[PDB]
């Protein structure tokens, strides 16, 4: 298995130092510590004996200063919604939670620049800015629990990535605490600033291996005056792809989301979540969202788009909604897919970037490769961004079924020059499969960067670079 | 200011470079004069060797040799940079990407373009536009600037408001490191979270951490309808409300929002002989839209102009959907920088400030600078809070520089602004980062610099504090 690196252990003196550093922010009770040690998928559990919950950036700096001198490994944790085992300890690394770093520092109603602490939950940030007629540039099904610091640390994609793009573009500045406790202030709240290297980009997608994000500056797009969502049934994946091409051609700049899900996904969300399908039974379903400034113009685009899609046979049945209650219910069919799979049994999860034309080929293949040993096999995700979420469910974990999935799925993906982790990141699960998507020379530079910023390696060990 | 202890180019080095790049070794000093002079014509190197490699392997092999010999190398693209970064300070080897001008691939569905770093931006725009796509950036230097130079400086530009930074639109880079190591981050995927986003280090590194040789970039679709509204505003307060209503009334179709003052219009008319199409106003704004339905776009701006002219935000205006007239309106703005360098000596500052206070420094400097400056102008990317502040003088005067500096840099810091929003640092601003970056940030930049280029052969005297 994996072996524990020669870190120190948490002593009584360390617990006393943490109570001094974070008064009332030291949890050592083993039953309370059980939940933060187990990941969201509940397939990994650490043996951490202390979870620290600082309130301020200075406290985070001082904690790591103490941990750097004492050589104690630290596992930063936000909402603990990560999918790659990066959010929980492997052995006894101190859990540093951002749960109390949940304050908004400022929001400028003209520029739409938000400055807030890393532990602010994304949905509450969305409600804050939408009260001021702006929106967050990303949204995910984990919005209710995931923290913005975790989102930046994982470079979270999400459901509006098609419209607003990466956090690499939307993060304007970061405050980061490094492994030795130096608070690196790169918290520029400016749209444009070319005064040296864009150091904050290193920490976007680094997953707490190069430093702990404590404050985030984010560009909030304006809240759209008109939001429409269309939910369509397609008779095949070829029609889904041409529907997407027609979608870009006819809706254009107002398109804010394009998601797909197969029939089995719809069945699972119907079975486990009791959500009736709003369309005719189809092999594939598509969720399109539009955001724009003129409701009348957006209605014309979508109407003419829909007229052509049904007329040319790309869509068999579809429905549309503008009412906020109904719009959210259609989104629920997509956002809650992840919940229904993990409740269906053991989930074999694969998050792949592939050529959009070949996005679903692996799902048909794995249904053929995997006999009755797979309970269900589903494919869905962000088709507009080339993102497939490949999931296999079974009654329980099987080494035989794992051997059929791996390395086959990773070799398939590499054959398409694709990404084995499009969005969710590397963490513990995918640390040894980066060669499928990254060349050795790139991986070495990541290691040299790690040694520069965290030479003792106390920040998220066993993560997220190869051994 | 003083030359670092690099080796000097020997006769054996020129023979070695001829083996590596046959026919790519230019040593004629008169031909070497133009690449030695920056675009602003205020920095001049004394380099005796210009190298024009064709392939990434030729760049790797040149730098392995340069790494062995500790010879300084000055990467160069279109030589349109504004911060003295693109020319040697002393005798650095100029490595031009002029011949690295091949498109490697373009997928007509995803719109992802992979091309060599030396491809000129305007030529690439024509190429992807022949396939109904566009570059995610465009600059006034489009006719000369290289995509490798654009990525190395993290160029913002005139459509930054719509498509954003190269940090978002660049998908992958192949970079040759100081020791010749070829770093392959040339992924053509929209989303890829397999480790650190190493390419981001080189976006804005200005050739100090490596030489970008191949670029992968997401090209947005070419819009079906481009409209340009050129309006005259009676004050900067009216400019700001024209911008605010614009976002509310045009919204997602908005692709550019530029502003310029009256003095800017006078210099482009005087030096470039371009006539204004609207009545004389103290401020002009250029609004561009890009959308998929030409009809919906036309209706959105018509309602916007009717309200803008109705509410007194605009006094006179013109509009064009014709490709010819759209370029004529755009020509008045893109080459203002050309019209400024032709007015005399130009003191140039590229500032990010709160948009509401963006022009306050222009009024301040005009009051502070009496008759001792020729003109003080303010223009640039108002949508991005990016002010191009320029002061002209009949000749350079150390008096006028002492009046402007550090005052201009201190003013911006008082606003928590950027002392180089767009153009970068280079040679001129290497010692002005304290106004925008704290010491801990600047310290880490040197640590990354020491890791990626321990000998410091790549772009010496750049772009970090001394
Ligand atoms: C229902 C559901 C839907 C999801 N949908 C999406 C989706 O659409 N797109 C997508 O990309 N992902 C998605 N995810 C996974 C995604 O990675 C997480 O939801 C989220 O982005 C991580 O935030 P978090 O606060 O939960 O971080 P955690 O899970 O707590 O941590 C994840 C990693 O980040 C590190 N980290 C956390 N906080 C910090 C910090 N302050 N500083 C430094 N490092 C830190 C941790 O050490 C760990 O390595 C989904 C997950 C769920 C459960
Ligand atoms: C008329 C005009 C308008 C402009 N408008 C804008 C604008 O709107 N926005 C904006 O941001 N800038 C603007 N610029 C300046 C802009 O920074 C440059 O024009 C351009 O982005 C750089 O390309 P280049 O080929 O000229 O690079 P160069 O000038 O040759 O070099 C620029 C710097 O990057 C380095 N470099 C160049 N190529 C490479 C490479 N392949 N690999 C590594 N390092 C490299 C050089 O060493 C140097 O430090 C304008 C310039 C002009 C003359
Ligand atoms: O699909 C999954 O199981 C993981 C979450 C995914 O990012 C989503 O888009 O919902
Ligand atoms: O204006 C300047 O001094 C330099 C060029 C500038 O980036 C522009 O937007 O035209
Ligand atoms: Zn997803
Ligand atoms: Zn500019």
Curated annotation (Swiss-Prot), chain A:
Q: Does the keyword Metal-binding apply?
A: yes
Q: Impact of altering residue 338 to A?
A: Significantly reduced catalytic activity
Q: What is the effect of changing residue 392 to A?
A: In D2HGA1; uncertain significance; severe phenotype; significant reduction in catalytic activity
Give the top-rank taxon of the lineage listed in the UniProt record for this protein.
Answer: Eukaryota
Provide the effect of residue 120 to Y: In D2HGA1; uncertain significance; moderate reduction in catalytic activity
Q: Changing residue 349 to A: what effect? A: Loss of catalytic activity
- Quick one: effect of changing residue 137 to L? In D2HGA1; uncertain significance; almost complete loss of catalytic activity
What does the entry list as the binding residues for (R)-malate? 334, 338, 349, 424
Q: What is the effect of changing residue 323 to Y?
A: In D2HGA1; uncertain significance; moderate reduction in catalytic activity
Q: Which residues bind Zn(2+)?
A: 382, 389, 423
Which EC number(s) does the record attach to this protein? 1.1.99.39
* Chain positions with N6-succinyllysine modification: 49
Domain (FAD-binding PCMH-type) spans 44-223
Q: Name the coenzymes or cofactors required.
A: FAD
Q: What class of enzyme is it?
A: oxidoreductase
Q: Which UniProt keywords apply?
A: Disease variant, FAD, Flavoprotein, Metal-binding, Mitochondrion, Oxidoreductase, Transit peptide, Zinc
Substituting residue 367 to H results in:
In D2HGA1; uncertain significance; moderate reduction in catalytic activity
Q: What is the annotated localization of this protein?
A: Mitochondrion
Q: Name one GO biological process term.
A: response to zinc ion
Similarity-based family: Belongs to the FAD-binding oxidoreductase/transferase type 4 family.
Q: Which disease is it linked to?
A: D-2-hydroxyglutaric aciduria 1: A rare recessive neurometabolic disorder causing developmental delay, epilepsy, hypotonia, and dysmorphic features. Both a mild and a severe phenotype exist. The severe phenotype is homogeneous and is characterized by early infantile-onset epileptic encephalopathy and cardiomyopathy. The mild phenotype has a more variable clinical presentation. Diagnosis is based on the presence of an excess of D-2-hydroxyglutaric acid in the urine.
Protein name as annotated:
D-2-hydroxyglutarate dehydrogenase, mitochondrial
Which species does the entry assign this protein to? Homo sapiens (Human)
The organism that produces this protein has a lineage beginning with: Eukaryota, Metazoa, Chordata, Craniata, Vertebrata
């Amino acid at each position: 298995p994996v072996r524990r690196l020669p870190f120190s252990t948490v002593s009584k003196q360390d617990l006393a130092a943490f109570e001094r550093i974070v008064p009332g922010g030291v949890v050592t009770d083993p039953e309370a510590l059980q939940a933060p040690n187990v990941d969201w998928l509940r397939t990994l559990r650490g043996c951490s004996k202390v979870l620290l919950r600082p309130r301020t950036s200075e406290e985070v700096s001082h904690i790591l200063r103490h941990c750097h001198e004492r050589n104690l490994a630290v596992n930063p944790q936000g909402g603990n919604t990560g999918m790659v085992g990066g959010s929980v300890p492997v052995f006894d690394e101190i859990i540093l939670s951002t749960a109390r770093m949940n304050r908004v520092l400022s929001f400028h109603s003209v520029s739409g620049i938000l400055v807030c602490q890393a532990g602010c939950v994304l949905e509450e940030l969305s409600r804050y800015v939408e009260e001021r007629d702006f929106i967050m540039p990303l949204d995910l099904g984990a919005k209710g629990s995931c923290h913005i610091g975790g989102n930046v640390a994982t470079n979270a994609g999400g459901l509006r990535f098609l419209r607003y793009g990466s956090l690499h573009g939307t993060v304007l500045g970061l405050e980061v605490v490094l492994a030795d406790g130096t608070v690196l202030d790169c918290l520029t709240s400016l749209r444009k600033d070319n005064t040296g290297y864009d150091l904050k980009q290193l920490f976007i997608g680094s997953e707490g291996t190069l430093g702990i994000i404590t404050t985030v500056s984010i560009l909030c797009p304006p809240k759209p005056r008109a939001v429409n969502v269309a939910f369509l049934g397609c008779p095949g994946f070829a029609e889904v792809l041409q529907t997407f091409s027609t979608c870009k051609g006819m809706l254009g700049e107002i398109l804010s989301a394009f998601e797909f899900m197969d029939a089995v996904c719809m069945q699972l969300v119907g079975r486990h979540l009791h959500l009736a399908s709003p369309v005719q039974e189809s092999p594939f379903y598509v969720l399109i969202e539009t955001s724009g400034s003129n409701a009348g113009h957006d209605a014309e685009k979508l109407g003419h788009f829909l007229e052509h899609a049904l007329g040319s046979g790309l869509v068999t049945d579809g429905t549309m909604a503008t009412d906020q209650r109904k719009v959210k219910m259609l989104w629920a069919l997509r956002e809650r897919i992840t919940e229904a799979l993990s409740r269906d049994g053991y989930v074999y999860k694969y998050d792949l970037s592939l050529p959009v034309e070949r996005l679903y080929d692996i799902v048909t293949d794995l249904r053929a490769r995997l006999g009755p040993h797979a309970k269900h096999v589903v494919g869905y995700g962000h088709l507009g961004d080339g993102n497939l979420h490949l999931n296999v469910t079974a009654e329980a974990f099987s080494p035989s079924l794992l051997a059929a999935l791996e390395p086959h799925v990773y070799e398939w993906t590499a054959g398409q020059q694709g990404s084995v982790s499009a969005e969710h990141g590397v963490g513990f699960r995918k640390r040894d499969v980066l060669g499928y998507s990254k060349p050795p020379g790139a991986l070495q530079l990541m290691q040299q960067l790690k040694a520069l910023l965290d030479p003792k390696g106390i920040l998220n060990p066993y993560k997220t670079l190869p051994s």
